[PDB]
Ligand binder design. Structure first.
Ligand SMILES: Nc1ncnc2c1ncn2[C@@H]1O[C@H](COP(=O)(O)OP(=O)(O)O)[C@@H](O)[C@H]1O
Ligand SMILES: Nc1ncnc2c1ncn2[C@@H]1O[C@H](COP(=O)(O)OP(=O)(O)O)[C@@H](O)[C@H]1O
Ligand SMILES: Nc1ncnc2c1ncn2[C@@H]1O[C@H](COP(=O)(O)OP(=O)(O)O)[C@@H](O)[C@H]1O
Ligand SMILES: [Mg+2]
Ligand SMILES: [Mg+2]
Ligand SMILES: [Mg+2]
Lengths: 349, 349, 349
């Protein structure tokens, strides 16, 4: 029996994942306290399970705890922090989003021989430091998820020879383009992978050799600390205080709505803030281009094709084309590049 | 033939109802017992049928009891207590007020196979608490009504899959404005209905989505149970006992005459209580605004059009404009918002 | 002058004490030898006096014995028994624990002729059997205690008519909730309080009368000797030695850490005993289900609230929910449940 495989992304913009059977889930990194949903059931019947994940979690002593999670969490004004959310990998906030995307992707009642090979991700510089905090976490991981309003459960438990760790964007450029990168790579060319995340952006590059195989360069690749979408949400936060001049603060929902579209329905009116949206997209891309050439000296002329990824890279792409025009390009799925890049690369074993 | 529909509200200021054929009747929720009326029939023959509803109602054991009900029972001193009466839905005072609203709206020649889809309702916090008690009541509602001085007898009995249980304020804004409010709602706003009634104030809100479709907020919407127009009838009679200086109390007719005008006829004189009436209509409006704003934080700036309804919401519209000026609005029928909202949203069955 | 209030508990697991001004202490009930602490001062800060309890005790005949007690004594390998500690309530061990309890709670700058009223704890059967043994030893008390490395002594003396005696589980529901649950208690129910102590578990119920006052049932309430947290340390003792397969015994310290973690670090390795530790609490959870219904026939259905107490029940609340799910509930401070009741109900004088 071929043991199952689930690859998930432990991001902070939105939690991404995909199973062995190519079903993929996506939801923001937002939790909230769960409460009993019976009245709104009669109003709006829940068909999208992902939109309204109402969920209970058991543990080693059945210490039951319910959660509004996902879009259901984002509907709450009592939701997660999301502006100073936990960077510790062993937080319960990380435990919620990890266990939730399991039962979204585990098919019902798998055989016990067919256990699940989970392949997860870390930040590039933080792959070494927070490895044992997550290696201990995944080995200790033994719970029972309960789906409220959808009513199917998993006794989630994982061990070694099933848990698998890779940095952010490890097998995204090695595999999944593995038959198409062979035309790209010739001899001593430099491929580039840029995952524009929420908190940090990882620029990860491989060096191909005389034997046409990519070797890793930890000196041309690092974690751009504090550079991502979190600057754009912070900058557009101050633009609302500058335009409305009320001192009012947008919530978690309105500020994410602001940098998604540019127009917030404030006091019956669309406060138009579209001007500093694309200006922040240029300024973030300018921060990326300038910090691209920090690690990159004259080796930028050794490029064959740069790939970009991340949810931020999908909306930056025209201004993020200004790294290397007509050579840098977008990956097939900007969000899900790490997802299948952990999955088929995790299906190697 | 086709099964009929009669949409009535179990109102405690006045019973609000309208049938499938768009005939509507309305009467205060006051019952008495009944005695045969032939003396005043010679003086005042019944021109207004609703003004003088003497009613005889058989039951499943055919143990009939006579009842003065409505404006007639308001003219009776032997009427129900009605100001400290419970809102228990299977009580004897509710079987009379429901059936009296039936036979005024029941058209002639309804066969027994064309069972009336009575669209009943429960308040917003009471649609979970008091749902099975009306399932207790409507299953038990097996009676036979007879009108006095008009004399057409309707065999009143209702079963499951004919009866209908929507929340109060649910279909009043999900339907009945659904073709018009969608022109006003575009993106992630909150539409809301506040039914300021007699005992309860149903503040019910929806959240619309990107697709201009409302999802229900069960945490920004609640019933202000015990907060309504019954506090104004409570407040102003206390000011009259110190103004009359006899210690006497206005009864179930004169107290309704008191806060509706401000000046009660006492011993050849209309004793004035105009000053504290506006104070009663600000203090009630003080805790419909601020009690909604306990559920309405900074998402109140994302509101588009707050609707208000109810007979109390009809008469607070100057003071209840102070929820948010030039954003709040009154529905065209403050009485028949819920009843047509029962009816229009009861057309789906 | 005024006579102050200090409430302590003679819990065999850990002594739990509080003054009138709500400054409360907690430390395990283990003593050891007191030796010269000079060198440990220079390396590490002796800041928390609860962490570093080096104690000299003068007698009234001044024999001047010296003790490590509690947390520092827990780190001593030559400590007290604590798994077969003697049940003599008049022991010097109990005195040293009580003198340490009084020392951290008697404040400085207390006026000259002030004294303290003190409240103790007794098992509910042993409050009458073992009454005068403790009630003479508290009268016997006149000692001077010295806290090393903090430089303040306490000459502590008590007489008759200042000590006060109430048994275990008394004040936690007779007071401390009497202002709150009196809204909840109506007529002829029983409230529940389950103190999950270290050695003995406490079952106590109060009948409420018609007039909303608590009254006591001696045959619906008992003291569970031999039932409590102490069975779990006995169970996990052999559970390690059988799993060590060497006869290697944990110390007194790792014994306490074992039922707090289940993963003891041993010979450079985590010995995981999570299997038996889940079973042992459920073994204790089973043995309180049966003793509950031993005192509760159909009178279990005559409940309106069940509380639980004891430091063990804090990690057993969801696991002792199996008797009455959501009819049972949790006290605020499961350690300090008896003491705050002894604080509040001890304020009769
Ligand atoms: N359609 C979109 N419009 C605007 N921003 C988007 C869109 N899609 C994704 N994003 C941004 O991308 C981020 C998602 O990044 P993601 O690839 O999940 O990285 P991470 O792994 O760090 O979470 C979100 O925080 C969001 O701001
Ligand atoms: N013209 C009016 N003047 C004063 N008060 C009115 C008037 N019309 C209605 N009301 C008040 O509104 C209440 C009716 O509320 P209603 O919408 O029937 O709510 P409910 O469903 O709780 O009975 C009455 O009790 C009455 O005090
Ligand atoms: N955090 C914790 N983890 C595990 N066990 C605990 C914890 N806190 C308290 N306990 C257990 O509870 C006991 C304390 O019980 P306590 O309320 O002091 O009762 P007593 O009055 O009999 O001493 C300890 O022996 C300990 O085993
Ligand atoms: Mg990422
Ligand atoms: Mg109403
Ligand atoms: Mg105790």
């Amino acid at each position: 029996m071929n043991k199952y495989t689930i690859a998930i992304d432990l991001g902070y913009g939105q939690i991404k994942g995909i199973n062995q059977d190519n079903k993929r889930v996506i939801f923001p990194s937002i939790i909230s306290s769960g409460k009993d949903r019976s009245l709104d059931t009669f109003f709006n019947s829940i068909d999208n399970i992902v939109d309204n994940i109402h969920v209970k979690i058991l543990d080693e002593y059945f210490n039951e705890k319910e959660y509004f999670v996902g879009e259901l969490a984002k509907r709450q004004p009592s939701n997660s922090s999301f502006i100073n959310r936990d960077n510790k990998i062993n937080s319960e906030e990380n435990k919620v989003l990890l266990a939730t995307a399991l039962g979204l992707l585990i098919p019902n009642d798998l055989p016990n021989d067919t256990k699940i090979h989970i392949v997860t991700g870390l930040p590039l510089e933080h792959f070494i430091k927070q490895k044992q905090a997550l290696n201990d976490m995944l080995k200790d991981f033994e719970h029972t998820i309960k789906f409220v309003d959808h009513n199917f459960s998993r006794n989630i438990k994982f061990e070694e020879s099933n848990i698998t760790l890779f940095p952010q964007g490890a097998g995204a450029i090695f595999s999944k383009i593995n038959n198409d990168i062979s035309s790209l790579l010739i001899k001593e060319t430099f491929i580039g992978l840029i995952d524009v995340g929420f908190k940090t952006t990882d620029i990860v590059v491989f060096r191909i050799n005389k034997d046409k195989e990519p070797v890793f360069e930890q000196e041309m690749s690092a974690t751009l600390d504090g550079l991502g979408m979190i600057n754009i949400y912070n900058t557009m936060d101050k633009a609302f205080t500058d335009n409305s001049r009320d001192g009012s603060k947008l919530n978690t929902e309105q500020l994410m709505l602001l940098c998604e579209e540019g127009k917030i329905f404030f006091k019956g009116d669309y406060i138009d803030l579209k001007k500093d949206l694309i200006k922040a997209r240029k300024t973030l891309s300018t921060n990326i281009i300038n910090k691209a050439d920090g690690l990159w000296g004259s080796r930028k002329n050794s490029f064959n094709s740069i790939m970009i990824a991340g949810g931020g890279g999908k909306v930056l792409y025209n201004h993020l084309k200004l790294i290397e025009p007509n050579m840098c390009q977008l990956i097939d799925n900007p969000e899900f590049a790490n997802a299948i890049g952990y999955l088929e690369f995790g299906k190697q074993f």
